[PDB]
């Protein structure tokens, strides 16, 4: 996954992606 900031930012797509982020 590439150009992802807001969702890193996050919390619900954080634990969706915790390994690819």
């Given amino acids: 996954a590439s ?4 969702c ?3 919390p619900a797509c954080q ?3 915790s ?3």
Avoid: E, I, P, Y
């Fill in 19 to 21: 390994d690819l982020c």
């Fill in 8 to 10: 890193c930012s996050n």
């Fill in 3 to 6: 150009g992802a900031d807001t």
């Fill in 15 to 17: 634990v969706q992606h």
